Scaffold this active site. Structure first.
Site, PDB file in Angstrom:
ATOM      1  N   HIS A  62      44.546 -34.493  84.792  1.00 30.98           N
ATOM      2  CA  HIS A  62      44.598 -32.941  84.595  1.00 30.98           C
ATOM      3  C   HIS A  62      43.477 -31.931  85.185  1.00 30.98           C
ATOM      4  CE1 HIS A  62      47.363 -34.397  81.424  1.00 30.98           C
ATOM      5  NE2 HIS A  62      46.265 -35.077  81.015  1.00 30.98           N
ATOM      6  N   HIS A  92      34.295 -28.882  83.142  1.00 31.66           N
ATOM      7  CA  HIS A  92      35.280 -29.202  84.098  1.00 31.66           C
ATOM      8  C   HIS A  92      35.660 -27.763  84.406  1.00 31.66           C
ATOM      9  CE1 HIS A  92      36.924 -28.311  80.315  1.00 31.66           C
ATOM     10  NE2 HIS A  92      37.730 -27.783  80.668  1.00 31.66           N
ATOM     11  N   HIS A  94      39.164 -25.070  86.058  1.00 38.33           N
ATOM     12  CA  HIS A  94      40.659 -25.251  86.483  1.00 38.33           C
ATOM     13  C   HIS A  94      40.853 -24.086  87.698  1.00 38.33           C
ATOM     14  CE1 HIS A  94      41.437 -26.157  81.935  1.00 38.33           C
ATOM     15  NE2 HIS A  94      40.204 -25.777  81.791  1.00 38.33           N
ATOM     16  N   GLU A 104      41.955 -19.036  83.684  1.00 40.40           N
ATOM     17  CA  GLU A 104      42.596 -18.947  82.512  1.00 40.40           C
ATOM     18  C   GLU A 104      42.194 -17.720  81.828  1.00 40.40           C
ATOM     19  OE1 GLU A 104      41.517 -23.113  80.429  1.00 40.40           O
ATOM     20  OE2 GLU A 104      43.534 -23.416  81.393  1.00 40.40           O
ATOM     21  N   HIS A 117      34.241 -24.387  82.692  1.00 44.39           N
ATOM     22  CA  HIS A 117      34.099 -24.578  81.087  1.00 44.39           C
ATOM     23  C   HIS A 117      33.199 -25.677  80.978  1.00 44.39           C
ATOM     24  CE1 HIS A 117      38.500 -23.024  80.549  1.00 44.39           C
ATOM     25  NE2 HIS A 117      37.701 -22.065  80.742  1.00 44.39           N
ATOM     26  N   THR A 196      42.094 -25.288  75.647  1.00 42.78           N
ATOM     27  CA  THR A 196      43.062 -24.585  76.361  1.00 42.78           C
ATOM     28  C   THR A 196      44.046 -25.936  77.023  1.00 42.78           C
ATOM     29  OG1 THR A 196      42.073 -24.535  78.401  1.00 42.78           O
ATOM     30  CG2 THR A 196      41.894 -22.608  77.238  1.00 42.78           C
TER      31      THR A 196
END
Ligand SMILES: O=C(O)c1cccc(Oc2ccccc2)c1
Ligand SMILES: [Zn+2]
EC number: 4.2.1.1
Length: 258
Positions: A62, A92, A94, A104, A117, A196
């Site tokens: 992911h 991590h 996104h 996000e 994050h 999230t």
């Protein structure tokens, strides 16, 4: 569970296995800068990462996580909206397939290229797994990434990604200094929300920095060469691993700055 970011297993599907996906305090949200109110009550934010001990980097299918030793108070977040002490466990990102999407949280509906994050848990609950069962269990520091000049403090991350291309791969990742990922200003917005990703638990005090960091196009391109798939499976590039904005519902976003 077999969730992901595609048409068939993406965010619109998550509520079937994780009904809290349609809850009252889901994340991310759009931050409307003309409705967030300055809160003079917020104490100063304290990011104490001097003694941080990074261990390993992992492709989980992911995103990738950079993991820290959280067995003592080595790298902690305090102050701001928080009561007590929150220990860094991992960070991590996104990111998008193109520079116009990937974050996000959004800012007046603006999407950034990526979002970092930094995940911390409240030490009053003893361990991470207990903390995520509590409304004040986690504090996530969110940092937007825009494409521009390279971020030197990111380069050790991008350079190890070749070694964790596929799901389940990990690499040693010691002596990484997460201070090199911060912008100059700690001005922030804060609101109560959630993880999230599944399990989408409603246990997070979100603290989102107003100032993005700049990274280079070459740096984000290397994020996009990761894979969601495992070794020896058909290639599915790890892009667009972001959940879109969720309803704000009965929540107020507070600003630390005027
Ligand atoms: O969405 C995230 O930022 C996030 C960060 C850390 C963990 C996590 O997922 C779990 C949390 C608790 C139990 C199992 C999984 C999600
Ligand atoms: Zn995240």
């Amino acid at each position: 569970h077999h969730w992901g970011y595609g048409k068939h297993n993406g965010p619109e599907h998550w509520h079937k296995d994780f009904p809290i996906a349609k809850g009252e305090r889901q994340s991310p949200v759009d931050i409307d800068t003309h409705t967030a109110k300055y809160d003079p009550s917020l104490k100063p934010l304290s990011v104490s990462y001097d003694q941080a001990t990074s261990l390993r980097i992992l492709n989980n299918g992911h995103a990738f996580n950079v993991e820290f030793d959280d067995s003592q108070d080595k790298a902690v977040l305090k102050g701001g909206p928080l009561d007590g002490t929150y220990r860094l466990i991992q960070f991590h990102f996104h990111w998008g397939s193109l520079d116009g999407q990937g974050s996000e949280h959004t800012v007046d509906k603006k999407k950034y290229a990526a979002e970092l994050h930094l995940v911390h848990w409240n030490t009053k609950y003893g361990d991470f797994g207990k903390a995520v069962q509590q409304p004040d269990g986690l504090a996530v520091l969110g940092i937007f990434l825009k494409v521009g000049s390279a971020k030197p403090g990111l380069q050790k991350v991008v350079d190890v990604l070749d070694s964790i291309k596929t799901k389940g791969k990990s690499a040693d990742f010691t002596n990484f200094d997460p201070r090199g990922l911060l912008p100059e200003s700690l001005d922030y917005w804060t609101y109560p929300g959630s993880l999230t990703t599944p399990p989408l638990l409603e246990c997070v005090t979100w603290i989102v920095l107003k100032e993005p960091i700049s990274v280079s196009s070459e740096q984000v391109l290397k994020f996009r060469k990761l894979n969601f798939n495992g070794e020896g499976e058909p290639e599915e590039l790890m892009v667009d691993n972001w959940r879109p904005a969720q309803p704000l519902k009965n929540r107020q976003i507070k600003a630390s700055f005027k």
